[model samples]
Target: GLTRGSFPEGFVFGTASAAYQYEGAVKEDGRGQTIWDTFAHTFGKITDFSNADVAVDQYHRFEEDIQLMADMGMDAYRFSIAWSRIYPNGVGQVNQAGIDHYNKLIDALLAKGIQPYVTLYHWDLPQALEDKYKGWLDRQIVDDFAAYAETCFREFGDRVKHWITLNEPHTVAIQGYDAGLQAPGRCSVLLHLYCKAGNSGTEPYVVAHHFILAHAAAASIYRTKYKATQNGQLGIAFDVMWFEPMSNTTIDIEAAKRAQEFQLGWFADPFFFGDYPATMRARVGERLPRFTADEAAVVKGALDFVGINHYTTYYTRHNNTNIIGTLLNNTLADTGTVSLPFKNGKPIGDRANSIWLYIVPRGMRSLMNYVKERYNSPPVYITENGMDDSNNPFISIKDALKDSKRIKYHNDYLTNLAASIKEDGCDVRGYFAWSLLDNWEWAAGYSSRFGLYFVDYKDNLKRYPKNSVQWFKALLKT
Candidate 1:
């Protein structure tokens, strides 16, 4: 029942995509290697045994894709620039071809009256940088990322007004370094049960420290050098999940707060409060990095808005025994809390194709209110929010297109989002769907489909609109 005019006067609706996930032609156009390329090529990394060497072919077909957005009456389109594309080696030397490709993509979006919200980094670290200095783990990357981000502002800032410095920094830190399930996989958990390298307890915190510094450096540069001339706003996209206490008991309630502090508060607290949460400093202790006074001055209040990529919610309870942390010696143990999608043998909500994603619409409203109160009601955007379906070969195209579940998922989530704005006054400004098409979903590869348009991978990557597409069209029809 929600409509474009349901909430705010200027709330924007759009679709979001990442360069590596959507853009193919990786080797062509003078593009250099990224860690994802290295990670995906390594055997047993991707579930589908797939690499995005020729992902959706968006590099060549962006015009067609832009037209699809135009058809949906999209007010904006959010996409990330492949850092390796611009600075092919991650540092010295600019690739003019890379610049031209994005120029064309940007101009086409403008022609369709869709504003572009560009994300500077979407987890594709140039393989050269990783080889040179372990990527995000090193302080050296601070300047390298600044150089790359500055190059983008100098080249593309003329047309692009909304810039996201990083997407899901917490995900990068935890998934890449702690879980070791993602690119540049490393974890010192269970004595290398999954990854051969990394100290899970220490490395995630270290990587996240550098990421926050990198974002501060870039955001500081934009504020001092570019914002005046370019007139663009910058923010980082955070991956968040609403956590509910397992029970109303004080310990469980405290556990839920600790879980949130470790997740959202870990990265965001610094920007808002000029330091990591007190809980983090207490629990993480010497393991967590400290920001110097000068660094805090620059890092605090760096963002023009807060972008949240919320997908699901989980129940949290206190872990009184240090058994997991003692045995694993990782970030999970550092928190002293256990999170699961279910409590009391009851699932939080219906499951999505991804094991982690569940449908919990009210969590959207709860998360927004939490952000509003915690961060003093800064402007927020639902950067990425959607569920996925199985890419089953058995389902016919007609049957697959009838994604009634996906339609309901968005409708329910959006209804809650609307309440967050209208009823709760959460200061939410925009909402971008997870994707425009079903492209390569990292690790899961093409097994999960989160697109409004169902992509036929076996047939020239053809796109067919699912029933949810009609739902969006109707919802957006002024």
Candidate 2:
């Protein structure tokens, strides 16, 4: 069993949450609607026909939640500031009520001795911005996002020492634009079968390009304006999946590299290396957007650290045949690699409630090493890492708190992560569990539970500690 002493000194352990996922009160306190609000209300969008109208009521009960984290001896709390909450319409006038809410939340965490790691945007784009200027697709979002980010820094930077400009921009680019399965959903692929209006071939790239610029813009503002006074560090949280080669053949090896390039490198390379991977540039060709010299200068070295949200691993094999036009111009098809959780009918590991997530402890260490090598061993934080459990209605609340599988998931993953730091010399600084309490998971709704503390939706959203909470408490105490 691993303990807090097993890891490096000053390494943080915390729970992670997004504003939309955790803070409900959607219409209260002068907070405007976000893209998620629009998406969740659309028919056939959410799996269970559920929306986060009152997700666990965290907006009203954050003090109780912070007390729970304090009781567990958590060192940090990674929570996001809702963009719409800050600027209800995403960039005109400020919302003082929204500022007051976060101010209280941050103050409460600090009073309980938990440091705040604040994420500016966690996939909550203001619906007004989307309606006005098409959101991330338009270059105008760069200025708007920077303005909003600066407002956050000005308001909350006094106590929030760690800031994340955007969370998982790659996922937004693909899921929202290319796949047409997420918020602000749009796609022209398959004759617009999934969404009414989007060029899947082109929109994902445009959206990703704008996201990079927006992140850089925010980072640049913080570095120039507030870093000296606030002494805060800025970074972006990237969603990464470790890709293992399906075979020892050179083709499969190259395919794995391509997969990483498309996923992590797609967002990170510009920050560390000043451009996209050569593999990406070669594959994407003219379809990919290029940064001008001025933009490149701003974008390069924009991050103070790297935040990784890794959950699973997949085996990748090369697909030699070109299927771009045949499949209606998917951004994923451009990589020419196939990635899946299974190999020859065998599983990667034990499966989680989400079909995409499979338990893969060793992948944590491997992914850290890869980030270390590729980014010249930058400071790293495992921003979001945890598996989900099924919210089975049949199980009683008493029985639901016994989560042995969730405990094993964290124990094994943290064990491998500790080894990576102690033995392999990876510069990992922190780890945050996916969440503190079970809330509304996007698309999956409340069906997937990924929290140390389970919230009973049936019983006035009462929070109960799972067995894993005791595990973390014990590990941290040691």
Candidate 3:
């Protein structure tokens, strides 16, 4: 029943993507390899034995893709600039060819009357940096990341207004460094059966600390040099999943809060409150990195908005046992909270294709309100939100394109989002679907189809509009 008219006026409606996920042509035009290239190429790293070496071919097909957005009546497009593309070696000479490609992409979006919300880093650190200094594990990343960020501001700031410094810094910290699930896979979990190197207990926090410092350094530089001229706002996109207390017990309620503190608060608190949560300080103790006064000054309140990539929810309960801590010894164990999609052996709501993604539309409103109250109502952008379907070969293309479940997913989620804005008064200003096309989904590979436009893998990567596309088209139309 909700239309664009049902929400606040001037709210942005669009689709979101990352360069590494969407763009293929990895070896083209002086583009250096990223950690993902190295990770994906490694056998058994990705599910379905897939790599993103030739993802959706968006690098050469931005124009056609831009037309797809326009056809949907999208108001904006949020995407990331590949750091490896700009700085082939992570620092030295400028890749003029890379800058030119993004210029074309930005210009093409602008040509179609769509705004571009650009992200500087979307978890694809240049492989050279990792080999040089272990990338985000070292303090040197702050300066190197700043230099790369300055390059984006110089090249694209004239047009790109909304700048997201980092995409899901928390996810990179836990998934990449702790769980050994993503690129630059590192962890000490299970006696290093998964990874060769990493202190799962300490490395996630160190990497997370550097993630904050890098964001602050780049933001400080931008605010000083570019904000006055570019007139753009800077922020980070956080991957947040809402959590509910598994029981009404006070311990269970507190456990849910602690879980979030370790998730969003680990990053947002540094920017907003000048440090990590009090619970974290007490629990993590010395293992958690401390920001000095100088670093604190630069990091505090540096963001102009909050970019939230919320998808699902889970029930959280206090985990009193140290067994989990003894096993994983990573960020999750540190929180002393256990979260799962089921309660009392029954599913919370419904399930998505991904094991982690459980459908719970109510979480949208809950999460929005949580952000509003916890962060003092900062302006937020729902930078990424959508459900996924499995790439079932048994299904026909026409049957696959129906996607009624995806339509309901967006509609229900958006309904709750609208309520949060209109009734709860959360300052959320934009909503971007998880993807424009079914491209590579990190470790999940091309097996997870989270796109409104179905990409045919059997045939030449032809995009067919799912029924959800029509749903969005009707909702977005004036």
Candidate 4:
């Protein structure tokens, strides 16, 4: 039961979008090329060799989109500012037109009485940075990111109050480095594996360390300069998935802990506790890079809230026989009891659009409980949570997606969320659907639509609402 009877009044409900994923008109307004721009053109990159060059065309259509938010009665709108838009060349200079576009966008949202929650970086690094330096792979990006953040704080801090430094550092680290699925794809899976394998190397940790430093630097700048005068808050958004053990056995519990450490704890540890989690450090050795005492102080108090982006939960089980090499410390391996060992007792669950997305409402409650217990119940907001069904050929299911599964998905998960708040007493504050409209689905390109508003890439990019949208609207209104 949800314990919905005791639901908090004034709880926020909203939707989110990234600049690269939604906004089109890529080359307009002196916008510099982003890493996505370069990666899409690179040989054998971007599943379709296509980029978000002309996505939802939101750059010109934001007026209509703001109305959509108003229609949703949204409490907040979470969007990102493209670094390339502000600093086309990464750091050497700033563009006034780019600044103007965002200023206008902020004003439009304010006009509609929708609070703006700005994410400074959402995987779109300046192509000029990619050319001059190696993007995030180069340590210099830490400084460049700080410069960009300082610029944004100085420019729009007055209008936009809530600021998110970066969106999903884990996605950046794993997809770009470990999995080789995203931009600047590299085979640095070794780094992830080595750390997980109990090695002592600090390469992966250092990368994460630098990312934390950048997060802290930007957060510190905003707090010191803006929070006082601009009357706002700053933090980092971390994407997380719930991990549960396949069984109640000791090995399964241990495996589950490791999985959580890798996925959720990795990012939370440095920001909240001032260093890596002890278990992770014990396992990784030198892989636990050290920050100066001063750096730790800066990073520890860097966040005002932790944006938890959860969509699904998975089962995990450990098996020594399946263990690999140095990849242990380098790769994000499952620590829970997976059926890989017995072929049947593996981690399994109710399925969703992608194999990675499984339905487990109880897991949502469990995850919230765990976050509260482990992180001392920090105020949390869901940055993204929604389902995807991109394929719509001839509209077999009608322009309206009878996504009853998604309805159930939201109901079950949000019910558990309500349970956590009312019964378990977790301090969760808000929820944001992963997207407003179905735009590009990254590597999947335009194939997967995760929007409440369906977009026809082939037929004038028309927007239509699916059943899930109606269901969500009901939930929001309730």
The regions of model 3 sitting more than 4 angstroms off are 189-192, 323-328
Candidate 2 regions off by >4 Å? 321-327
lDDT for each residue of candidate 3 in 367-387, tens digit (9 for 90 to 100): 999999998999999999999
Instruction: In model 1, state the lDDT of residue 325.
Output: 52
Q: Candidate 4 at 235: error in angstroms?
A: 1.7
TM-score of each: 0.98, 0.98, 0.98, 0.91
Which pairs, if any, clash in model 2? 188-198
What tens-digit string does per-residue lDDT give for candidate 1 at 176-228? 99889998999874756868788888999999999899999999889889999
The ten-residue window of minimal lDDT in model 1 covers: 320-329
After the best TM-score superposition of candidate 3, give how far the Cα of residue 376 lies from its true spot, in angstroms.
1.0
Least accurate stretch of 10 residues (summed lDDT) in model 3?
A: 320-329
- Per-residue lDDT, model 3, residue 303, is 91
The sequence of per-residue lDDT tens digits that candidate 4 reaches over residues 4-116 is 23458867777899999999889898999887887676766666566788989888888888887777667788899999889999988789999999999999989898888
Q: Give the per-residue lDDT of model 2 (tens digit) for 7-38.
A: 99899999999989888899998999999999
Candidate 1 TM-score, true structure as reference: 0.98
Candidate 1 regions exceeding 4 Å error are: 189-191, 323-327
